[PDB]
Amino acid sequence: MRRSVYFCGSIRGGREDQALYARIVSRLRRYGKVLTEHVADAELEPLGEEAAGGDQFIHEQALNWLQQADVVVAEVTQPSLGVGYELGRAVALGKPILCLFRPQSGRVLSAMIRGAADGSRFQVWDYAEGEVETMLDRYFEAYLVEHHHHHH
C-alpha cells in the first residue's frame, strides 16, 4: 500500500551530503515515502528521556526506518565503513537494495561488496558525477516499469 525508500549516504559530519540529501529526499518522497530525514533537520526536537543519547540513537533510528523501508538506495563515490554497514543490514532485513558507486572517484568496491551484488535484488550502478541523476532516473523509471525486483 505504501512504499518507503531509505537513502544511504556517507556524511561523516560533512556539509556536502546535506545538499544531496535535500534533493534526493524530495525525489524519494515524490514516489512514496523517504527516510534519512535526520540528515536534514535544523531544529533538533527537544524534550523526552534525559540521557546521553547520540551515536546509539543514530543506529536505532536507521534500524526503525529500514523496518518500513520496502527498498534501499545508496549513493557513495568511495568505500564508506558506516554506509557499508547499513547496506548489510538492508539486505538482511529487506531485500531490494541499490548501490551507486562512482567509476571515476579513484577507489573501488571490495570483494564483499561485489559479491553482495548477486543481481537478484541488489543492484550496483556506476555513476560518474553528473551521472548520479541518470542513475536515479533510471532506477526509479526501471522500478515503476518492472513493478517489482525479480529480474536478474
Ligand X SMILES: Nc1nc2c(ncn2[C@@H]2O[C@H](COP(=O)(O)O)[C@@H](O)[C@H]2O)c(=O)[nH]1
Binding residue ranges:
9, 11-13, 80, 82, 86, 110
The number of residues that bind ligand X (CB under 6 A) is 20
Partner touching 92 among its own copies, ligand X, none, CB below 5 to 8 Å by kind:
its own copies
The number of residues that bind its own copies (CB under 8 A) is 37
- 80: contact with ligand X by CB under 6 A: yes
Measure CA 147 to chain center: 20
Dihedral pair phi/psi, residue 69, rounded to 5°: -60, 105
| Annotation: binding site for 5-hydroxymethyl-dUMP | 9, 11-13, 80, 82, 86, 110
- 151: contact with its own copies by CB under 8 A: no
- 110: contact with ligand X by CB under 6 A: yes
* 3 state DSSP class of 81: helix
Among 37, 64, 68, 88, binds its own copies (CB under 8 A): 88
Where does this chain bind its own copies (CB under 8 A)?
10-13, 54-60, 62, 79-89, 91-93, 109-119
